[PDB]
Amino acid sequence: REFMAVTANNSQLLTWWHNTGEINTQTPVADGNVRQSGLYSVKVQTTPASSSLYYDSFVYLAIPGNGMSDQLQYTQGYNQTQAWTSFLYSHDATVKISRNGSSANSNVVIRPTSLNFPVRYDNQSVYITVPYSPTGYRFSVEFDDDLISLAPSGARQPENALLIFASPFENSSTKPQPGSPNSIAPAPGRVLGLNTTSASTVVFNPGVYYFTGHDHMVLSSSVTWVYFAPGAYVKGAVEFLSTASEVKASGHGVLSGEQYVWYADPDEGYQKASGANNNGLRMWRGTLGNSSQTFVLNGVTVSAPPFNSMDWSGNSLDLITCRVDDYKQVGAFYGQTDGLEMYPGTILQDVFYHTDDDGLKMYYSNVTARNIVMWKESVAPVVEFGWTPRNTENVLFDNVDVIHQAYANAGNNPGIFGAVNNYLYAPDGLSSNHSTGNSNMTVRNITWSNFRAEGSSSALFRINPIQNLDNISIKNVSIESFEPLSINTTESWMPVWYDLNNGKQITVTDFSIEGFTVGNTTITASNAASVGRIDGVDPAYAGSVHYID
Ligand SMILES: *[C@@H]1O[C@H](CO)[C@@H](O)[C@H](O)[C@H]1NC(C)=O
Ligand SMILES: *[C@@H]1O[C@H](CO)[C@@H](O)[C@H](O)[C@H]1NC(C)=O
Ligand SMILES: *[C@@H]1O[C@H](CO)[C@@H](O)[C@H](O)[C@H]1NC(C)=O
Numbered sequence: 001r002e003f004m005a006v007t008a009n010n011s012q013l014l015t016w017w018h019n020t021g022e023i024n025t026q027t028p029v030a031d032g033n034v035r036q037s038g039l040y041s042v043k044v045q046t047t048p049a050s051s052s053l054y055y056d057s058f059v060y061l062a063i064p065g066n067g068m069s070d071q072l073q074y075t076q077g078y079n080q081t082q083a084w085t086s087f088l089y090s091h092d093a094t095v096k097i098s099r100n101g102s103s104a105n106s107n108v109v110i111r112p113t114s115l116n117f118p119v120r121y122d123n124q125s126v127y128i129t130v131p132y133s134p135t136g137y138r139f140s141v142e143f144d145d146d147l148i149s150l151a152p153s154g155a156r157q158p159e160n161a162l163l164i165f166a167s168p169f170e171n172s173s174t175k176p177q178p179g180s181p182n183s184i185a186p187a188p189g190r191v192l193g194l195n196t197t198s199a200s201t202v203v204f205n206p207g208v209y210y211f212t213g214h215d216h217m218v219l220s221s222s223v224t225w226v227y228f229a230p231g232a233y234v235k236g237a238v239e240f241l242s243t244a245s246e247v248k249a250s251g252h253g254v255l256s257g258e259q260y261v262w263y264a265d266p267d268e269g270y271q272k273a274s275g276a277n278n279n280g281l282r283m284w285r286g287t288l289g290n291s292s293q294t295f296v297l298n299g300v301t302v303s304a305p306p307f308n309s310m311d312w313s314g315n316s317l318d319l320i321t322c323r324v325d326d327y328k329q330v331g332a333f334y335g336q337t338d339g340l341e342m343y344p345g346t347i348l349q350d351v352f353y354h355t356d357d358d359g360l361k362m363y364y365s366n367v368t369a370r371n372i373v374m375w376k377e378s379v380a381p382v383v384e385f386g387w388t389p390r391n392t393e394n395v396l397f398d399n400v401d402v403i404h405q406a407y408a409n410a411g412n413n414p415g416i417f418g419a420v421n422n423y424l425y426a427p428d429g430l431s432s433n434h435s436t437g438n439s440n441m442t443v444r445n446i447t448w449s450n451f452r453a454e455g456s457s458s459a460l461f462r463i464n465p466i467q468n469l470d471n472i473s474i475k476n477v478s479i480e481s482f483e484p485l486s487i488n489t490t491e492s493w494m495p496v497w498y499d500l501n502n503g504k505q506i507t508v509t510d511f512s513i514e515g516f517t518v519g520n521t522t523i524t525a526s527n528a529a530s531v532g533r534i535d536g537v538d539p540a541y542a543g544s545v546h547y548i549d
C-alpha cells in the first residue's frame with residue numbers, strides 16, 4: 001500500500017502526526033492545516049538500537065512573518081526558518097534525522113554543546129542518542145552545510161533550524177485523567193463558546209484548532225485548566241478570566257499565534273495596535289482579583305507570538321506567582337517577543353526560548369529560574385532588569401545556555417546581563433541621561449550562575465543602575481567569542497546614575513564576577529578590559545566591582 005506515517009504510543013515513547021500537514025514556506029497555511037518542514041524528517045526509536053521500526057515524529061515549521069509578506073518589516077529581515085519536533089519518552093531513545101534524498105552528507109553540531117549526545121552518520125541520516133532524563137531535553141541540531149552568516153555580526157547560524165524537544169510523560173497533574181470533572185472537549189476546527197462555558201477544564205485532543213486572527217481563546221471565569229494534548233495544534237492566544245487560586249495550561253501540544261499580525265490589538269479588531277500602545281495580544285494572559293493566584297504552565301510549546309509572550313492584568317501583581325516547567329517558545333521572529341514574566345516566588349525550569357526581545361525578565365523577588373536554553377535573536381539583553389527602578393531581592397538564575405545571539409548595534413541594547421534606561425524618559429532604552437533613577441530602591445541578593453554563551457556574543461554586561469545595586473554575583477560565565485568590535489555590542493559598561501528628584505548618586509555595592517572566561521582565556525582584574533572588554537565601569541563604581549579569582 002502507499003507509504004504512511006507510523007507513530008508510537010507505548011509506555012516508553014509517544015510520537016504524533018498531522019494528516020493536514022502542509023509544505024509551505026511563503027504563505028499562510030490553510031486554517032485546518034499545519035505548516036510542516038519540507039527539509040527535515042524525524043523518526044524515533046527506543047533503545048537498544050536495532051533494525052527494528054522507527055516511529056515518525058511530526059516536524060513543525062515556523063517562518064518569519066508567518067506567511068504574511070507585509071509583516072516581514074516587523075522582523076529582523078533574516079531568512080532563517082525554525083523547525084521543531086516534540087515527543088514524550090521514559091527510556092533512552094535514538095532520534096533519526098533525515099534530509100531529502102539529494103542532500104549531501106554533512107556533520108552536525110548539537111547545541112547546547114554541553115550535552116555531548118552520541119552522534120553517528122549512516123544511510124544519509126543522522127542518529128542522535130538521547131538519554132532519558134525526568135527534565136527532558138531541548139536542543140538544536142545544526143547542519144554544517146546549512147550555516148549562513150547573519151549581517152552585521154557575521155554570526156554563523158543554521159538557515160533552517162531544527163529543534164528537538166524530548167519530554168517526560170504526562171502525569172495526572174498535567175493531563176486530565178479519565179472522568180476529569182466538568183470538562184469540555186472542543187471538536188477540531190473553529191473553536192467557539194469557551195468564553196461562556198460553565199466548564200472548569202478545556203481539553204484539546206489530537207487535531208487542529210483555530211480562533212482566526214480576529215478572535216482568541218478567552219476562557220470563561222469557571223475555566224481553571226486548559227490542556228493541549230500531544231498531537232493537538234491550536235492556533236490562538238490564551239486569556240484566563242478566572243480569579244481563582246490557580247489557573248493552569250499544560251500538555252505537550254502547540255499554541256500558535258501565526259494567525260495574528262504583529263502587535264495585533266484585541267481591543268481594535270486585532271489590527272496592528274496604534275501608536276505602540278503596548279496592547280499587543282499576549283499568548284498567556286490573566287487578570288487578578290483581590291486574592292493570590294498561581295499560574296501553572298507545563299509542557300506546552302508556544303509558537304509565533306505576535307507580541308510579548310505573557311503579562312497578567314491587575315493593579316497589584318504581587319499576588320500572582322508562576323510555576324513553569326518543560327515549556328518552549330519557538331518561531332518568535334517578530335520584535336518585542338519577550339519571554340515570560342516571572343512574578344514573585346516563581347520557579348521556572350527546563351525551558352527553551354527563541355526570543356527577539358527581553359529574555360529573562362528579572363523584575364520580581366524570590367524568583368528561581370534554572371536549566372534554560374535560549375536562542376537570542378537581535379534585540380534586548382539576555383537578562384533584563386532595567387526600564388523601571390524596582391525593589392527586587394533574592395533571585396537565582398542558574399544553568400542558562402545562550403546557544404545563539406545575532407545583535408547588530410548598540411541601539412539593540414545588547415548584552416548578557418543588561419539593565420536599559422528608564423522607559424518613562426527613554427522609551428527605546430538607550431540614552432545618555434542617567435539622572436532619572438531612584439535612590440530609595442534597591443535590587444539585592446542576585447545570583448546569575450553557570451551561564452554559557454556559544455558562538456559570537458555581545459557584552460558580558462551593560463547595566464544602568466536605575467536604582468541601588470547590592471550583592472549581585474556572576475559565578476561561571478563563558479563567552480566563546482565576541483561579536484565584531486565595529487558594531488559596538490561587546491564592550492561592557494556601568495555608568496554612574498543619579499536620583500530623578502534629589503540628585504543623590506545611585507550606589508553599587510558588592511558586584512562580583514567569578515569564573516568569567518572568553519574562549520580559552522580566564523578573565524581577571526588584570527585583563528578585564530583588554531580581553532573581557534569590560535571597559536565602561538564608572539570610576540565611582542570601580543571599587544565595587546570585584547573579580548573573585
Ligand atoms: C533538499 O535539501 C536541501 C538541504 O539539504 C535543500 O537545500 C533543497 O532545497 C532540498 N531539495 C528540494 C528542492 O526539496
Ligand atoms: C539567506 O541569507 C543568507 C545571509 O544571511 C544568505 O547567505 C543566503 O543565501 C540566503 N538564502 C537565500 C535562499 O537567499
Ligand atoms: C464570546 O466570544 C465571541 C467570539 O468568539 C463573541 O462574539 C461573544 O460576544 C462573546 N460572548 C460574550 C458573552 O462576551
Ligand SMILES: *[C@@H]1O[C@H](CO)[C@@H](O)[C@H](O)[C@H]1NC(C)=O
Nearest residue numbers: 007009015016206229230231
Ligand atoms: C495515545 O493513546 C492514548 C490512549 O488511547 C490516547 O488518549 C492518545 O490520544 C494517543 N496519542 C496519540 C496522539 O496518538
Ligand SMILES: *[C@@H]1O[C@H](CO)[C@@H](O)[C@H](O)[C@H]1NC(C)=O
Nearest residue numbers: 243244288289290291292319
Ligand atoms: C475579596 O473579595 C471578596 C469578594 O468581594 C470578598 O468577599 C473578600 O472579603 C475580599 N477579601 C479581602 C482581603 O478583603
Ligand SMILES: *[C@@H]1O[C@H](CO)[C@@H](O)[C@H](O)[C@H]1NC(C)=O
Nearest residue numbers: 318344345364365366393394
Ligand atoms: C520573599 O520571600 C520572603 C520569605 O522568605 C518574604 O518574607 C518576602 O515578603 C518575599 N518578598 C516578596 C516581595 O514577595
Ligand SMILES: *[C@@H]1O[C@H](CO)[C@@H](O)[C@H](O)[C@H]1NC(C)=O
Nearest residue numbers: 393394395396397445446447
Ligand atoms: C538570597 O537569594 C537566594 C537565591 O539566590 C535565596 O536562596 C536566599 O534565601 C537569599 N538570602 C539572602 C538574603 O542572602
Ligand SMILES: *[C@@H]1O[C@H](CO)[C@@H](O)[C@H](O)[C@H]1NC(C)=O
Nearest residue numbers: 424425432433434435436500
Ligand atoms: C534627564 O531627564 C530628566 C527626565 O526627563 C530631566 O528632568 C532632566 O532635565 C534630564 N537631564 C539632562 C542631562 O538633560
Ligand SMILES: *[C@@H]1O[C@H](CO)[C@@H](O)[C@H](O)[C@H]1NC(C)=O
Nearest residue numbers: 398449450475476477514515
Ligand atoms: C562553577 O564551575 C565550577 C567548575 O569546576 C564548579 O566546580 C562550581 O561549582 C561552579 N560554581 C557554581 C556556583 O555553580
Ligand SMILES: *[C@@H]1O[C@H](CO)[C@@H](O)[C@H](O)[C@H]1NC(C)=O
Nearest residue numbers: 410411430486487488489491
Ligand atoms: C557605543 O554606543 C554608545 C551609545 O550609543 C556610544 O556612546 C559609544 O560611543 C559607542 N561606541 C563606539 C565608540 O562606537
Ligand SMILES: *[C@@H]1O[C@H](CO)[C@@H](O)[C@H](O)[C@H]1NC(C)=O
Nearest residue numbers: 480481482518519520521522
Ligand atoms: C586560544 O584561542 C585563540 C583564538 O581562537 C587561538 O588563536 C589560540 O591558538 C588558542 N590557544 C589555545 C592554547 O588553545
